[PDB]
Design a protein around this ligand. Sequence first.
Ligand SMILES: C[S@+](CC[C@H](N)C(=O)[O-])C[C@H]1O[C@@H](n2cnc3c(N)ncnc32)[C@H](O)[C@@H]1O
Ligand SMILES: C[C@@H]1NC(=O)N[C@@H]1CCCCCC(=O)O
Ligand code: SF4
Ligand SMILES: [Cl-]
Ligand SMILES: [Fe+3]
Length: 327
Amino acid sequence: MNPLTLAQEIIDGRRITREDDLSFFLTCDLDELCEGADRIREACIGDKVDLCSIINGRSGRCPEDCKYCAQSAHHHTSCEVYNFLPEEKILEACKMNESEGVDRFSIVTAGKALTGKEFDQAIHAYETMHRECKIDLCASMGFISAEQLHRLHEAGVTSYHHNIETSRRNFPNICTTHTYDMKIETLKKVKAEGMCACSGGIIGMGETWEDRLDMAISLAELGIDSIPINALMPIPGTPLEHLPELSEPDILRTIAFFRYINPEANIRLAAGRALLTNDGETAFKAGASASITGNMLTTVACATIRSDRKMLADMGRDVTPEYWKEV
Ligand SMILES: C[S@+](CC[C@H](N)C(=O)[O-])C[C@H]1O[C@@H](n2cnc3c(N)ncnc32)[C@H](O)[C@@H]1O
Ligand SMILES: C[C@@H]1NC(=O)N[C@@H]1CCCCCC(=O)O
Ligand code: SF4
Ligand SMILES: [Cl-]
Ligand SMILES: [Fe+3]
């Protein structure tokens, strides 16, 4: 077995399982694994690169203890602190991302879960966006209930984001206040609601190569539709502030095997894209088919949205959103 023929087999319908020799993806040649991942992406996704965007709808004060997170109240960081934003600020950002041609937009909230009056405020914001704007809609709100997921879906939200973060084995080393099992339960609810599930995690936090493979396999078993691969941005004041940043070859290997293991998913670049040369150009040629663009939650964009769209179009990818296709 070799990466080039294995990519052909997957194009022709083979699917990697937990019982396959996953160590192959660690020992095989990187450039061949990238080439094969790009071919799998071309066959299963095609040339569209889906671009999404986010707003930090509620910043800081989270009681959870995730070791990477700027917004955990267990850490003293530079993060802004505010309760759920006024609707006008959300609509301003939605309209801006639509003016720039982004495919979808998400409200992302710090906290264990968004509940009660602030949840109602989010719903109202989605109703206004669904009425006024053509850009598609996502939410990332923590451990919400099935009834809340249905309310989001009825208001026009089509994807729910809930990252597994790390492998099951490594999860207790990153967070003690909630569990990996709790993440999987939310994801099952997202699928039962008929929404797209967007779930990935963070690499470079000290997890092993085998943990990264287990993340990829676990998301494949769930049928996850969109998989954000964040490289750690070490945040000053958090426990992980002094971890070394990942190299481009290590990120590319990860993107590529996530593509082999999740051939039909959008493998999506997310935080840490500045670690890649040319703001991720090579990753789009190594299995990635989607990216978050523009500003993140407490850190700034690696480039403007326009720069990302021009880079992708110049390499021959399609970045025209559906709402700009008039005829
Ligand atoms: C989506 S959560 C917000 C909603 C909710 N509180 C939750 O945890 O599901 C924000 C996402 O940002 C990513 N993230 C946070 N801090 C990061 C960092 N320093 N480097 C890379 N990714 C990070 C994590 O993967 C996390 O899932
Ligand atoms: C929510 C978006 N979806 C995802 O998987 N990561 C994004 C957020 C990245 C945050 C990077 C660190 C920060 O800005 O605090
Ligand atoms: S639950 Fe979400 S906001 Fe809270 S510390 Fe963890 S990643 Fe950050
Ligand atoms: Cl756990
Ligand atoms: Fe603490």
